[model samples]
Target chain A: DDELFSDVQDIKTALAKIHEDNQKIISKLESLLLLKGEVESIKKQINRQNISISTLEGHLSSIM
Target chain B: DELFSDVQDIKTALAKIHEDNQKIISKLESLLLLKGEVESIKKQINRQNISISTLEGHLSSIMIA
Candidate 1:
């Protein structure tokens, strides 16, 4: 029936929208991983800075 | 009649694809929540960094005195 064909067309359109949405989600996941890497690097920088602070404190104590 | 049968087949395939997309969307929702938590952690790290910098400056002043 002609009505049946129209129904199929509507469903196909819905499926296409779902496909596009999934693609966007995948892209977001990719960005999230990149951000995680940046956070890890910043943590490493923080660790190095802490060590520097400790050494500076030790030097000041010696001066006093 | 053959055209009707072929449309039915396509309909079934599209439904399967739709089902698969639902699964992926569910998993992606979890990942999005995790992303939010990670962002929170990054903010905390920035706060810690500023505090440490302040401490370093204070120590430098003490040394100079």
Candidate 2:
């Protein structure tokens, strides 16, 4: 049937869209991992900053 | 027709794919929003970096004073 062929064709095209969307989702997943790693680095930076602040406060007491 | 059953199976899969795509679309939005939050987090940490340098700088000057 002509309609049946058209139906299959529609499904084929639909699959391509799904395939494309999946690729985008995968890309975003990769990006998320990169951001996660960067966020971890950021946490360490804050931790170091706090350590620095603590040291400086100790210096202040000595100055007093 | 024998082929009718084949197409029916395909149709079943297509429906599932369609549903799955909706959830994917929804998650995509959530990830995009998280990306925005990370940008904010990025800037705040960099700003914190400025504070870190200043604290050390002040401490060094105090040591000499």
Candidate 3:
């Protein structure tokens, strides 16, 4: 039936859109997670640097 | 109405394409951000390791899931 053919075509197009959407969602989530991890790591590094600075200051004070 | 059905189908397809395109752009942006962050982290690590290693290791690899 011609009607059936049209219906199938419609659904095929819709399926493509769905698949694309799913891929996009996956990519977005991956990026967000990666960014979050990088931010946390940076924070940890900053804290480490601050502590080192404080230790150095203490040593300087003791010398003076 | 046959004409109405056809029009509706076209409209549905158009809507779907538009929605998917929007989502694709969002993902593309996110991927670019991740790529930049990855590069920056690698650069930082390489700088830190320069003190101990004279040469940078070329152990490049990709991980996907």
Candidate 4:
């Protein structure tokens, strides 16, 4: 139809869309990888801070 | 509140998931191509390996020699 790839001229247009989609997918993958790392670090912090004995130490340390 | 942000994360994750899905679909497409190629090869092999009366007659002549 009148979508991205309509004819001979649109083949390049279709390929460009495919490339754009691939870049978006890769970018999303990179962002998600960073966010996953952040989540891991946050979990480690939460675990360290949530310990009963460390609770006071945590409060004391957060003064910075 | 957080849903939108999480949705962003999900979309990011799902974008990769969608790409993965495309790869899987492409792999399937390739598998179908291979299957078609195999069918063609099988036909070619069968034609070349066809056994007829002339083949048996040739074999008998070679065996008797």
lDDT of 1 by residue, B1-65 (tens): 86677678677767777786776777677667667866876786787678677767777788678
DockQ of candidates 1 onward, in order? Answer: 0.23, 0.23, 0.07, 0.01
- Candidate 1 local lDDT, residue B37: 64
Instruction: Report the C-alpha lDDT of model 4 over A4-58, residue by residue, as the tens digit.
Output: 2235335445555766777776565555444445544654654454453344434
> What lDDT score is found at residue A17 in candidate 2?
78
Candidate 2 per-residue lDDT over residues A1-64, each given as its tens digit: 7887787778777776776777687677666656656666776776787686778767765774
* Candidates ranked by lDDT: 2, 1, 3, 4
lDDT of 2: 0.72
lDDT of 3 by residue, A8-47 (tens): 6777677666767767776767657666676668857955
- Model 4 chain B lowest lDDT segment of ten: B45-54
What would the per-residue lDDT of candidate 3 be over residues B1-65, giving only the tens digit for each residue?
66667667777766867787776677677667767866776676565555223211221111111
User: Alpha-carbon error at B65 in model 2, in Å?
Assistant: 9.3
User: Across the candidates, what are chain A's individual TM-scores?
Assistant: 0.89, 0.84, 0.60, 0.53
In model 2, where do residues sit more than 4 Å from their true spots?
B2-6, B15-65
- TM-score: which is higher, 2 or 4? 2
User: Would you give the TM-score of chain B in model 1?
Assistant: 0.70
Cα displacement (angstroms), candidate 3, residue A62, comes to: 13
